[PDB]
Design a protein around this ligand. Structure first.
Ligand code: SF4
Ligand code: SF4
Ligand code: SF4
Ligand code: NI
Ligand code: NI
Ligand code: NI
Ligand code: NI
Ligand code: NI
Lengths: 419, 421, 420
């Protein structure tokens, strides 16, 4: 814990609070007003170090139930600070004030949302304590790169309408930077091991065309973390000793994994799953499995609670996919790795995928359609994907695959067996 | 199969303690709301009972023609040097244990309301009830060579005496029940355990606390304490509440050490107040099972006695096969039906406010406790009206619209597990 | 395992999976349409010539498309360590040391030897002497210690093919009679191949004269022949001592043997019971049996049959539960011949307690299931009592049908119980 004498009710409610309409002190954004929650870098000649101010009415000073602004602007300057340290530093707001209740905040880029609740308004002390806590934590956790920190908490419409421009596109474009950067354009793939607490053997090598299975750490973020902290869990790895571009195995990756994953796993194949895939830790967003009977791939996310054609639901699959065991045929991948060019390149990529939940089809509809159109599979390739309503068993799915002429059936199968 | 050595012409076998009853084919009925019977193990003074006074106060099986209803009140009064008044239910459970899973009369509900349908073949064979109590004398003396001193059986038959015996049983029920709700987790610094279930689940260890009952639904914390007092080297040993590791999630060093010892080191960390992270294992005898649905953001409390589809897409039997045996599966928990009424019912996961689906029978049986707990939690007495049932829908797509229409409070809470994104 | 003689086609491990249709089929040799067979016969050095490909008939380079060439592969071996019992094993190795080359699509064995060669060899100039010399060189490389003189004759004369297939079929009948004669009571030592350990080191298929191995092809005779050829090989005799549970088939000596070559991961072993200490499967298994407490009986499903099952999960789920070297009680992987074995879980009710089987399996075992029912007194009508997918498929479908047809398992002692 943090052990501060704050009034706010210490809890994990910041993550995904869906506030009731009849209680919320502030529900910003929502197609009605601006919204933001931002950490940015400013010049040394226009900011004051240690200043903590709460612009607009305080928590107690206004009655509950209104629709007013909310937002934390943390302006930090240092000698070595760069413009690319925002996405990694700002995430730490989810670990300073996140032991509290009555908030909703994320994604400080160009347009999206921010909120707050009531019951954290009359516990005795004001938001100035929150600002001071944030200033202290930013001065403490990152002493190398920042030398002056200022915090403001705006709650007035006009001063935050300028900030309406700060919650949708910057970080979206920062991951689109991974999208546009090719796998081989860069010359140093980065590592990730922060998930060692649940699975130490997980040494996840992130690439500019393959986000980590956590869904949060990318190559740009790993590089920024290394620049912030050379000793940090993300470490730099050059590319040496090419073995096979088809599966994507180098020498430095293999040696690093062998000497860091406790010698359980030696070789790694970035572009395929059926031979030397990458380990997981239990933080995967989706699960990818092989269906020789359907001759394709099955992808199921965490938020599905139904029956699967393979016969096992997601909860059962996580029992064996995770842990840190190099299992061929099963893997855990993020929901943004599906729309990547190097997504199981050897094993058919997007073509081999057959079945996935309907909700995940809708969420990834546009990107999957774009990726299918890029590869020539046709714009209507998403309709060729069998959903849960179409059939929950292999014997049900196969007639639909025959009807729709799925390309997975047409091409050759994989992983034959012995007698 | 357990055997005996009593000399009676009746057919000892599948027809004396463990099968259903119907009124039409019943020869003589012993119990129910019409001709109530019971079975009590109380404590009385030495002068109140002659040692080994196995009697039959009233007609025997042959002396009664088909048409008359009588009870068999097995009033096993026990006097001892060290016996207490709290030790009654521990032995009282064992009286029907000699013939429960074999012999085939009835024991409805539990405790002291066994219902006996004495067969016509037993009446024709013309035995007596003296040996019925003689069997419960020798076996009782064999099982308890350290507490009991005198054992009696006093089978009454008079209808007014039937009502008097029923009133005595109801008086004893209140004494045995009111103590449990008085206890609390914080009051006592010692927690007992239970490893009786290792016969078909060696890797499973179940921790019992004043508020959390055992998953078997049978033993409580008081029962475990009484068994430890009676059996100092039995399958239950005390553990001091020491070495606190996680206060909110309920983890202690001593509990972790005990589990790491007994559970063959497969389980080392256990949480006493949450399901999604380090849930407690289960033998396979759980009264009910609760699963977490990320789509609905809540708990589905489906019990063993209810057969049917569940929102997760499978019946109780499949979930039991997935969970029981000691497999520590996050997102699923095996609990006793009374544990739902505990004040510390998954406090780390928001408690009763995170329950969205219950079967109709289980919901109706626990209406009285769910309303009382909703009033205490501040959710209001109408909380049971917000809980979906199988009539509302057997699938997520059928109950989610009903849940959002009812404004279930769990929709206003954050999801579970350890966050990463 | 490559070669040296130049061929009109390549030589790689990936050509064994080639797909050739009827239009691309130049001339088949054997299978379900035409007669062709392999053979390995015991000979002496009196009238054998090394590498003599005595092709009696037209060569494969001068045959019209769509024709038929009956192929009799006679193998003449001069071996000091060789015996007449090693003939089948070498035949199996014909599959191993022939498919490594392109165009050598070879399937089945015995009188069902099916080899297909497309026009990629006939049009590009491949002779039958190429095949003969390739087989000779493959036998020399695979078995350099035992063989000394090799003659891979390839008869292609229809009259000679038939009069030689008569000898081959008589030899096959003798092999089958030798398999039938031996029984687990008289035979003291079993064997175990570890070719299946290439994926699951802990797993060890156990092969006995009555209960065949999980692979369904390596019988007791073949394992004994391989041990005689290769004493260092995976198979090792196991003395029959330390009988702990004769009801379910527990021997302490076999338990020690399991300790020896399975990293001591398995303590005991019930050869006649799958519930207590079963044996896992590496995928070589040909069928899966499971226990159903609802009907209290065994269910057996072969690999080729998928779909919904009374146990509640598909065959893929069962394979995942039992395969991968993982030992799970209550389920087992078995070979097809084991169903007809008289040691079929005798303590666990034998054939009586297994009622749910696919109809195709009933048709395959028409001379086996009925014969076993007659042996046990069940009568040939027991197949009517056998639940098949043509009548009932789910638990509820067979719930009243078992009672109507007189289910024997419920009429006998059940297994497994609850707690309270
Ligand atoms: S996704 Fe999680 S486990 Fe994988 S590298 Fe990133 S932090 Fe580590
Ligand atoms: S309820 Fe059952 S499993 Fe739990 S401690 Fe008691 S006997 Fe053991
Ligand atoms: S059945 Fe499988 S594991 Fe056993 S000897 Fe044969 S190939 Fe090896
Ligand atoms: Ni993880
Ligand atoms: Ni139990
Ligand atoms: Ni149990
Ligand atoms: Ni095998
Ligand atoms: Ni196998």
């Amino acid at each position: 814990s943090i052990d501060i004498d704050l009034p706010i009710n210490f809890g994990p409610a910041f993550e995904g609070e869906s506030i009731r309409k009849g209680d919320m002190h502030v529900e910003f954004g929502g197609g009605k007003t601006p919204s933001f929650e931002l950490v940015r870098m400013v010049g040394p000649d226009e900011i004051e170090d240690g200043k903590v101010e709460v612009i607009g009415p305080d928590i107690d000073s206004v009655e509950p139930g209104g629709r007013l602004p909310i937002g934390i602007v943390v302006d930090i300057y240092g000698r070595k600070m760069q413009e690319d340290f925002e996405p990694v530093l700002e995430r730490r707001i989810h670990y300073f004030t996140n032991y509290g209740e009555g908030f909703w905040h994320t994604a400080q880029r160009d347009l999206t949302w921010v909120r707050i609740s009531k019951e954290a308004f009359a516990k005795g002390a004001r938001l100035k304590h929150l600002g001071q806590l944030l200033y202290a934590k930013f001065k403490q956790e990152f002493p190398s790169i920042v030398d002056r920190v200022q915090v403001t908490i705006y709650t007035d419409e006009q001063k935050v309408l300028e900030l309406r421009e700060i919650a949708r596109k910057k970080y979206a474009e920062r991951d689109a930077r991974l999208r546009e950067l090719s796998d081989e354009a860069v010359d140093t793939y980065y590592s990730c091991l922060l998930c060692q607490s649940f699975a130490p053997t997980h040494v996840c090598i992130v690439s500019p065309e393959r986000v980590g299975l956590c869904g949060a750490i990318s190559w740009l973020d790993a590089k920024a973390a290394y620049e912030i902290n050379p000793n940090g869990p993300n470490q730099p790895i050059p590319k040496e000793g090419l073995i096979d571009p088809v599966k994507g195995q180098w020498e430095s990756f293999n040696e690093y994994i062998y000497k860091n994953s406790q010698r359980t796993i030696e070789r790694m194949n970035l572009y395929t799953i059926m031979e030397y895939p990458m380990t997981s830790c239990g933080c995967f967003e989706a699960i990818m499995a092989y269906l020789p009977e359907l001759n394709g791939f099955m992808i199921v996310n965490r938020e599905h609670s139904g029956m699967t054609p393979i016969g096992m639901t997601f909860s059962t699959l996580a029992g064996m996919v995770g842990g840190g065991t190099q299992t061929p045929g099963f893997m855990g991948i993020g929901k943004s790795y599906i729309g990547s060019r190097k997504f199981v390149k050897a094993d058919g990529g997007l073509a081999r995928v057959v079945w996935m939940p309907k909700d995940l089809k809708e969420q990834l509809r546009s990107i999957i359609e774009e990726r299918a159109e890029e590869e020539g599979l046709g714009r209507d390739f998403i309709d060729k994907i069998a959903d849960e309503t179409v059939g929950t068993t292999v014997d049900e799915v196969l007639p639909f695959l025959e009807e729709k002429g799925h390309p997975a059936l047409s091409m050759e199968p994989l992983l034959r067996s012995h007698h």
